[PDB]
Design a protein around this ligand. Structure first.
Ligand SMILES: Nc1nc2c(ncn2[C@H]2C[C@H](O)[C@@H](COP(=O)(O)OP(=O)(O)OP(=O)(O)O)O2)c(=O)[nH]1
Length: 627
DNA sequence: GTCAGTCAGCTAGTGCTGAC
DNA sequence: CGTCAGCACTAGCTGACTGAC
């Protein structure tokens, strides 16, 4: 059949027909600013669509490429970019189709698999690398990862997804595909009924490419309607900062962090042997052999028939640590808690890491998402590296590459600094500029001791109670916030005394608490001005959103600045979890990397917070687990 | 010889339960 | 709190073991 093979020469199979070739005029601008009447072939659909979204497109094959098409990109200010891939695993998937939507022109689509010369793509690379031109990508993370992997460079992003979700204010957490936003903001239906059609095949059908072009083309009108809204609410700053953190996250994902195989295997052997002997000990201790040692109800029944009683002689009803922490008297309970802690560590960490280690490179690669979190913080997906245990300093399994070196840094008490900025309290400014940690000052006011006498044991109470009441936490509940968590223990009278004392001096915190309680607004804001709306008033969330949001924003600015500066020495940003940036560099450059890091984070802090200085604790470590 | 009816193993799902 | 993983229990599905006139 010639009808299906009508345009087979361009590597397109005409499955559904419904297209027609066209060769018309295009008035481009010559490099000498001379208007030239160059003509370009372009296909079009016979069946029209009711929407105004553009649907035309040129296919530029190696045998069909012409130099004059490159003139179209001249003088532009922005363009679209939609990339098609054969799969989701970036390390082992090949970029199929790269579209560009240039305004008042059809979408240029590069059939990559048929492009066998480097002289074609460099025209696209020059556009991608220039910072003066803005780029628009739906979910820019994925396309940026694939591009950077395959030897491209893209130097400006305007993620419509980020603008949409920041305008959503975390009201609806789903419905952010391209169709959703396009319907909500453009009154157009894209008809994305493509059920993930076959892509690895060299030949491609007409419907697939035509619908792919529209998904690329619609983004320009979406950007025009989005920039007006984002400027309307004065959310320009947050969008500007958030768009530039796409590239650092991409570099973290593509680099990842290496894992030591031999150390991990050795650790598995020792922990497994210890688990076996301890499980045998427990099974002996329970006085019965049929018990499945894991089951909560079975072990609870075993304890109950073993006559395990509390201080008041009452039988145990729960195995919760918050309940079992007070029942340390029994010999069996110590072994039981030991067993369960060891099993949690084993299953969570040692059986899980071998599943997520790439044998091809011996590296672990996370998946990072930025606005997925309520407060806007980073969340580590798949291997949740926010979840790697801190016990034993298990991070020594992780290491840098064969010859490089880790240089980690972290903010020292960023959260309380943000509180100091927002509340405008004189005492916290006094303490900070006098070079005294707010934990130390809190301990001093609690104990009324002289300044150097704030020992670690005393400072623990301050460290707990500060974070306790800085978020408006009930003084009755401080007993429960202590008895179960951290290492505090008190009574009601002392709870009341501490609650009175803290707000006796920290006038700013009291004022902030009273106003946040009174207003009861459905909306709250940060220093970076990101906006969120809660379904109903809630004291704890209402207090916690601004401080932690600004803390996240400072880290994001630090990340973009660090990407900007590190390029000279070929540095790479590896991981960041909780106010802690980890970079990597080959030896002989450490003396410079330390300075670049501290300067970048200092400028980051100086941008947002003016009154109070920052203080960055920096260390250079052979392994992530260095003390 | 055959086919309902009750007996199921299994599959899924919500409930509930401990962990840094 | 958030998260994830892990385990009973309860209820519905898809074939095997009868029971028969
Ligand atoms: N108990 C508790 N811990 C949380 C919660 N969310 C996060 N965390 C963890 C991760 C945070 O990084 C950590 C708070 O302690 P940090 O590690 O930030 O300590 P800090 O920077 O004060 O360290 P330093 O005093 O210098 O040793 O607690 C939560 O809701 N409850």
């Amino acid at each position: 059949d010639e009808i299906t093979k009508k345009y087979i020469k361009d590597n397109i199979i005409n499955v559904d027909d419904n297209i027609i070739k066209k060769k018309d005029i295009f008035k481009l601008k010559n490099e000498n600013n001379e208007i030239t009447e160059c003509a370009f072939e372009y296909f079009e659909s016979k069946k029209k669509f009711d929407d105004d979204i553009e649907s035309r497109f040129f296919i530029i094959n190696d045998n069909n490429y012409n130099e004059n098409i490159n003139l179209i990109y001249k003088d532009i200010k922005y363009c679209g970019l939609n990339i098609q891939t054969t799969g989701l695993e970036v390390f082992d998937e090949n970029i199929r189709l790269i579209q560009i939507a240039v305004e008042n022109y059809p979408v240029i689509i590069y059939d990559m698999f048929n492009i066998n010369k480097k002289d074609i793509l460099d025209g696209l690379r020059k556009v991608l690398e220039n910072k003066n031109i803005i780029k628009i990508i739906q979910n820019g993370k994925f396309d940026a990862k694939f591009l950077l992997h395959n030897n491209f460079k893209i130097e400006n992003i305007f993620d419509t997804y980020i603008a949409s979700k920041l305008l959503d204010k975390n009201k609806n957490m789903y419905g952010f595909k391209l169709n959703n936003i396009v319907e909500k903001y453009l009154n157009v239906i894209l008809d994305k009924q493509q059920q993930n059609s076959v892509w690895n095949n060299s030949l491609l059908n007409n419907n697939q490419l035509f619908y792919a072009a529209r998904d690329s083309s619609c983004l320009l009108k979406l950007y025009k309607k989005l920039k007006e809204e984002i400027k309307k609410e004065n959310l320009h700053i947050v969008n500007d900062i958030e768009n530039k953190c796409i590239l650092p996250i991409c570099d973290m994902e593509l680099n990842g962090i290496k894992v030591d195989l031999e150390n991990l295997q050795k650790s598995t052997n020792e922990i497994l042997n210890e688990l076996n002997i301890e499980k045998d000990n427990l099974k002996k201790k329970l006085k019965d052999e049929n018990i499945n040692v894991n089951s909560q109800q079975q072990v609870l029944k075993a304890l109950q028939k073993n006559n395990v009683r509390d201080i008041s002689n009452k039988l145990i009803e729960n195995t919760s640590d918050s309940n079992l922490k007070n029942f340390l008297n029994h010999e069996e309970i110590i072994s039981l808690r030991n067993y369960r802690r060891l099993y949690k560590l084993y299953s969570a960490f040692y059986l899980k890491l071998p599943l997520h280690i790439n044998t091809k490179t011996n590296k672990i690669h996370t998946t990072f998402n930025q606005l997925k979190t309520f407060s806007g913080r980073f969340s580590s997906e798949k291997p949740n590296l926010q979840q790697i245990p801190r016990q034993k300093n298990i991070r020594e399994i992780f290491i840098p590459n064969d010859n490089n070196i880790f240089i980690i840094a972290d903010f020292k008490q960023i959260e309380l600094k943000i509180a100091a900025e927002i509340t405008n309290d004189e005492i916290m400014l006094k303490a900070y500029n006098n070079n005294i940690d707010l934990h130390t000052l809190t301990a001093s006011i609690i104990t009324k001791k002289n300044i150097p006498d704030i020992n670690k044991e005393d400072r623990h109470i301050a460290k707990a109670i500060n974070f306790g009441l800085i978020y408006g936490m009930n003084y009755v509940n401080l007993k429960n916030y202590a008895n179960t968590y951290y290492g505090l223990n008190m009574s009601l009278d002392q709870c009341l005394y501490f609650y009175n004392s803290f707000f006796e001096h920290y006038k700013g915190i009291y004022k902030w608490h009273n106003q946040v309680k009174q207003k009861r607004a459905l909306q709250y804001s940060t220093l970076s001005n990101r906006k969120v709306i809660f379904p109903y008033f809630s004291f704890t969330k209402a207090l916690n959103y601004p401080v932690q949001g600004t803390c996240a924003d400072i880290l994001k600015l630090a990340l973009v600045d660090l990407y900007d500066n590190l390029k000279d020495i070929n540095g790479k940003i590896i991981l960041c979890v909780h106010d802690e940036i980890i970079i990597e560099v080959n030896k002989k450059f450490q003396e410079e990397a330390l300075k670049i890091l501290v300067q970048s984070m200092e400028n980051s802090a100086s941008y947002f917070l003016k009154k109070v200085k920052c203080e960055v604790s920096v260390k250079i470590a052979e392994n992530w687990g260095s003390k």
